[PDB]
């Protein structure tokens, strides 16, 4: 409007707020809002202080709360924004809160008067109010936010989620003011109509956080609040909203099912949900299993999706036959990431080949074992058997596959006492063998047991290579592993019969030949064109050569997804190795074939000026398989000689440098053989050092295919290539190579190879430091790092800082795994490397750790917990993880049993109050049981563990994987009960008297405080309120009893029409501010619905309030 900014601040701000008051006449709203902008700029550049502003805070509050009452939305938004910049400490907020400005803020929230910019500043102001001091938040804005978020979805309000977010932010710092007005019920009923997964889990996390700490656990009821979310499943006819559109009744039901499913699978990822849902009483998990045993084919088919998504198992296809849904849960099934464009061989080898770690704890197995034991304890297997027998076929197939997956998980991640009597299945075998029941139940039980045996055979088969490159890689690795440590003749007759029936020599028409017979002639042992010199065999191999050459354009033109596409490629590979099987007679065909191959590849790569572009022919036809021939030419020692007789390796070396085609480098890097030293490793090193960044990343990622497949002598060159890749310019390639090295150092022969070529892993992030800490696990390398002053430098660093950062690391990994947090299918949550775990291994750093006396303060911290704040809980988590990593070997239990701290952790795992550390203790006791002595110690305290490693799939019942579980799972589910925080005249006259006949103060709870006007007459010297025009006192109590009766929501129409007739007959009874303050105080203490609350707040809209304005202008000037 007219800013100067160079004057006396007292004169300026006095004319500023005087023009804000404006005497309710002769001042426009535009100059007032520009003045409010000038005021907030002046408060921005000059700091708020009562001496340099020239006025007390109170007058600024009185002349800023008048800006909320003007009819223009812009001046109201400007007043709210200027009030937000004033609240900076607790005293200003207390002075703002003493006179009832919160009534005006709660008024400006709930009007929805086409203002989405004016309601944003109010929410920002109350977020600032929660931020400054949340223990002084008023009940007015709390009731306003609860009324908006409780009945906002039906009224199409667009501020619903923005209000529920503020309610959830308020419930973390001041839970009593939210639980008193019923905000937790609003949160809990708002997770059942929210299809968005992240918002649903963010809403359920606050409810599960109040149930964690006892001081907040006193604000939640026992079995009626949290168990509401499994009410769409337990109640067959569930009606969430009382008044909804009857046209949408099925889509609403599916929305309730989806939101309740997301809430159920989001409470089972938190420890406060696992413990509170599996309590030993009449819990909420037994009501979930009990409704599964009831033949209702709508709830029963929907609970199986929840059971499939809890245990992280893949869903089968919806069919009626077991053999079709068994094929869809095959772990080696084709996926869209395995295509050549996205993830050709490396992403497939990640899935089908197993991880190199056989003794890492893998905390996902700990969590799944705890969940499976808690579900089996409440009788899930009997319910699954009852669903298998007495149901439809569509549900019986899905329940049979679920029972097969659970029975396979039982003999893998559960301890022996938990899982030695599960595979008998008494309730199903006694039904399959009883000839007294009707025969249908017996036969379907026998069919179910046959399908379970078939699923067990499918599980013990394993994943198979879908592709033909990875198949050749695994076959070559198995062949060299067999070859490192150590049939019929059919001379001329049967060979001639087989080549006669093969139909190759009869007619030259392709796709009509008998390719099984061709494969049998080419793969028979002693026919190799070197001992059987017959002209018919030469004709046969010449016809096959002319078919397989790309220049003839016969094999290179058939497209992908062909009927017989893999068979022709397999026959081609065994044919081009059969040609090499005669090394002195098989040159004239093999040289011609490889010359035609390199001619085609030079023509298609871009080494010619004709087109230099044939990516549309390689990517969709079988002509991309000509690398595989080079692959099966590259394994044999006589193969590399023949391959170098032609210009093949130099051709790939020139292919490495180009920039336009990235698929050809993917094809040649996954086909060649790197078993022996030669020119094949030079091409791999050239792709790894100087190529396109995407091809460089894929070549760095293709070392898992050479690591997990157990290619021999990997520690010689693969470690060298990884160390060379660590110095790359790109960051993702270096981080990926760091991850490959962190996986590869799980073998001692690879860690010894890495230590012998000392790298620089300190200039990278925390992953490089965690990889370098693995050097301490063996004496050769610990003794190397100890001389340069590194272990003593890391000891105090991990003592002061990195003990409480390791817990952040493992919690971040678990949250990224199974809570969908994403800090800015089942994964493998492998345990990070702890220095205390590496020092103990070799008995020298064990003594180096013992002389520092770090275990004593750790046991003192575990024995003396505070359990009140949130920093000491973090310190206790750090100490528990440190003790669990110390007790991971035999040299750690020796110095850990001298203080006797294992019973302390065992008692903390079942008698603690906070449940997050009660789960942390379970993980730590699992990590303790990685040795035989640890499991023997835990057995005396009635805690079983798994005694097998991850080496064999089926180990004979008599280093380990870290997993320990109590013998009775209900021991850690005991919670000591906390009582709820609640257990600790004219109304009779108006029934028989009408309003007109009684026509021929009324404020009940009105005092000096809690009034909009009467608070100021004492502190700031406001003049007392005037005498208004017994004629008005009765209308006051009449409108008060009407707005009281409007709270029950029984018959709202009569009361609103009565209020409308009162406003029509007497438009001046809604002008006294001492009545508006009373009805605002009544709104601040009752449960009004949102349209009723909006109507009540809008009744007092077109009011003047002249007297407070003029006396504020009088008290100012």
């Amino acid at each position: 409007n007219v800013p100067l900014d160079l004057t006396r601040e007292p004169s300026d701000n006095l004319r500023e707020i005087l023009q804000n008051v404006a005497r309710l006449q002769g001042v426009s709203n535009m100059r007032k809002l520009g003045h409010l902008n000038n005021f907030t700029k002046l408060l921005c550049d000059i700091g708020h202080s009562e001496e340099k502003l020239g006025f007390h805070y109170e007058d600024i509050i009185i002349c800023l709360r008048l800006a909320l009452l003007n009819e223009a939305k812009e001046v109201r938004a400007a007043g709210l924004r200027a009030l937000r910049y004033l609240i900076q400490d607790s005293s200003i907020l207390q002075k703002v809160l003493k006179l009832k400005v919160d009534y005006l803020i709660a008024r400006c929230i709930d009007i929805q008067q086409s203002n989405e910019v004016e309601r944003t500043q109010a929410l920002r102001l109350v977020r600032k109010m929660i931020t400054v001091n949340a223990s002084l938040f008023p009940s007015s804005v709390t009731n306003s936010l609860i009324a908006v978020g409780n009945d906002g979805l039906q009224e199409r309000d667009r501020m619903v989620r923005a209000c529920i977010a503020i309610i959830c932010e308020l419930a973390l710092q001041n839970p009593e003011v939210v639980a008193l007005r019923g905000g937790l019920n609003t949160i809990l009923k708002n997770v059942i109509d929210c299809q968005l997964s992240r918002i649903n889990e963010a809403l359920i996390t606050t409810i599960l956080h109040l149930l964690n700490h006892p001081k907040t656990r006193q604000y939640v009821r026992a079995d009626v609040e949290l168990e509401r979310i499994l009410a769409p499943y337990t109640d067959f006819h569930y009606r969430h909203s009382p008044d909804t559109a009857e046209g949408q009744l099925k889509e609403d039901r599916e929305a309730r099912f989806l939101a309740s499913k997301m809430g159920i699978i989001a409470t089972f990822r938190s420890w406060a949900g696992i413990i509170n849902l599996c309590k030993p009483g009449n819990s909420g998990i037994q009501s979930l299993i009990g409704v599964l045993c009831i033949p209702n084919m709508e709830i029963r088919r929907g609970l199986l999706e929840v059971l499939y998504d809890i245990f992280r198992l893949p869903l089968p296809v919806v069919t009626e036959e077991f053999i079709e849904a068994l094929l869809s849960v095959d772990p080696g099934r084709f996926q869209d990431s395995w295509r050549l464009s996205d993830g050709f061989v490396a992403a497939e080898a990640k899935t089908i080949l197993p991880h190199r770690a056989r003794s890492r704890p893998d905390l996902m197995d700990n969590y799944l074992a705890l969940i499976l034991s808690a579900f089996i304890r409440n009788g899930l297997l009997e319910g699954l058997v009852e669903v298998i027998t007495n149901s439809d076929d569509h549900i019986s197939v899905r329940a049979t596959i679920l029972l097969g997956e659970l029975l396979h998980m039982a003999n893998t991640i559960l301890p022996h006492s938990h899982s030695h009597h599960l595979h008998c299945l008494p309730t199903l075998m006694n039904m399959a063998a009883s000839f007294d029941i009707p025969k249908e139940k017996r036969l379907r039980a026998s069919a179910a047991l046959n399908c379970l045996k078939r699923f067990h055979e499918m599980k013990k088969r394993g994943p198979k290579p879908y592709s033909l490159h990875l198949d050749h890689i695994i076959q070559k690795a198995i062949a060299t592993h067999q070859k490192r440590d150590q049939i019929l003749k059919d001379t001329e007759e049967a060979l001639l019969i087989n080549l006669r029936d093969s139909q190759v020599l009869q007619h030259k028409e392709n796709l009509e030949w008998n390719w099984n017979l061709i494969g049998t002639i080419l793969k028979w042992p002693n026919v190799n064109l070197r001992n059987y010199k017959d002209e018919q065999l030469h004709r046969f191999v010449r016809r096959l050569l002319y078919f397989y050459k790309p220049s003839s354009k016969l094999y290179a033109n058939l497209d992908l997804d062909f009927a017989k596409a893999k068979q022709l490629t397999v026959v081609g590979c065994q044919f081009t190795e059969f040609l090499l099987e005669s090394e002195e007679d098989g040159q004239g065909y093999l040289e011609d074939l490889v010359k035609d191959i390199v001619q085609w590849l030079n023509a298609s790569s871009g080494m010619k000026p004709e087109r230099s572009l044939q990516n549309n022919g390689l990517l969709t036809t079988l002509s991309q398989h000509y690398f595989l021939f080079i692959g099966t030419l590259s394994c044999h020692p006589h193969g590399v000689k023949m391959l170098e007789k032609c210009s093949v390796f130099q051709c790939l070396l020139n292919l490495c440098s180009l920039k336009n085609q990235d698929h050809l480098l993917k094809l040649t890097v996954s086909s060649l053989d790197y078993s022996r030293d030669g020119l094949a490793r030079v091409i791999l090193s050239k792709i790894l050092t100087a190529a396109t960044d995407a091809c460089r990343l894929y070549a760095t990622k293709h070392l898992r295919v050479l690591l997990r497949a157990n290619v021999e002598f990997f520690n010689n060159w693969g470690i060298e290539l990884l160390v060379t890749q660590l110095h790359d310019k790109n960051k993702t390639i270096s981080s990926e190579a760091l991850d490959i090295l962190d996986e590869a150092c799980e073998d001692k022969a690879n860690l010894h190879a890495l230590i012998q070529m000392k790298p620089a892993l300190s200039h990278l992030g925390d992953k490089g430091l965690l990889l370098l800490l693995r050097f301490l696990s063996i004496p050769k390398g610990f003794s190397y790092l100890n001389e340069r002053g590194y272990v003593a430098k890391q000891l105090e660093k991990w003592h002061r800082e990195y003990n409480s950062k390791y817990v952040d690391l493992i919690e971040e990994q678990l949250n990224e795994a199974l809570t969908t947090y994403r800090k800015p299918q089942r994964p493998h949550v492998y345990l990070p490397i702890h220095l205390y775990g590496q020092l103990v291994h070799h008995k020298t750093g064990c003594h180096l750790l013992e002389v520092q006396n770090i275990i004593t303060e750790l046991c003192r911290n575990v024995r003396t917990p505070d359990l009140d704040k949130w920093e000491e809980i973090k310190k206790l988590k750090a100490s528990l993880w440190a003790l669990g990593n110390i007790g991971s070997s035999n040299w750690g239990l020796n110095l850990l049993q001298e203080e006797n701290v294992i019973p302390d952790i065992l008692k903390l795992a079942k008698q603690c109050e906070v449940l997050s550390i009660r789960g942390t203790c379970v993980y730590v006791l699992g990590l303790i049981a990685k040795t035989k002595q640890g499991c023997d110690i835990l057995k005396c305290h009635n805690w079983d563990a798994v005694r097998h490693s991850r080496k064999h799939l089926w180990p004979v019942v008599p280093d380990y994987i870290g997993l320990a579980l109590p013998v009775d799972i209900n021991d850690i589910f005991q919670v000591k009960d906390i009582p709820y925080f609640q257990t600790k005249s004219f109304h009779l006259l108006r029934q028989q008297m009408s309003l007109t006949e009684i026509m021929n103060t009324g404020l009940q709870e009105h005092t000096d405080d809690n009034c909009l006007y009467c608070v100021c007459i004492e502190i700031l010297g406001f003049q007392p309120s005037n005498q208004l025009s017994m004629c008005r006192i009765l209308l006051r109590k009449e409108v008060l009893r009407l707005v009281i009766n409007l709270s029950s929501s029984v018959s709202t129409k009569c009361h609103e029409t009565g209020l409308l007739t009162i406003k029509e007959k007497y438009p001046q009874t809604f002008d006294d501010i001492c009545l508006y303050s009373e009805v605002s105080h009544l709104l601040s203490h009752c449960t009004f619905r949102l349209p009723c609350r909006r109507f009540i707040q809008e009744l007092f809209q077109d009011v003047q309030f002249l007297q407070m304005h003029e006396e504020a202008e009088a008290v100012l000037a």
Binding site: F236, H237, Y238, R239, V291, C293, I294, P295
Partner: protein, 72 residues
């Protein structure tokens, strides 16, 4: 959710009624001291609710002589 109620399963409503399978009680409404008594053998595990303002159920017991006794 009251017009939606049209059938009742005994596993969901009252699980002690369908697990009887034999009783010493007589079938209600039929007992005379000059005749051999009919004992309650079984109870059907599904009831059908009649669409009315009071919703009367349709219980059907099964006596020891192989005859069904339908009640309301």
């Amino acid at each position: 959710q009251l017009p939606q109620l049209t059938s009742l399963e005994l596993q969901y409503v009252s699980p002690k009624l369908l697990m009887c399978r034999d009783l010493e009680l007589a079938v209600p409404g039929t007992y005379d001291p000059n005749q051999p008594i009919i004992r309650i053998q079984s109870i059907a595990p599904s009831l059908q609710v009649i669409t009315s303002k009071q919703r009367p159920r349709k219980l059907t017991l099964m006596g020891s002589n192989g005859h069904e006794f339908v009640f309301l």
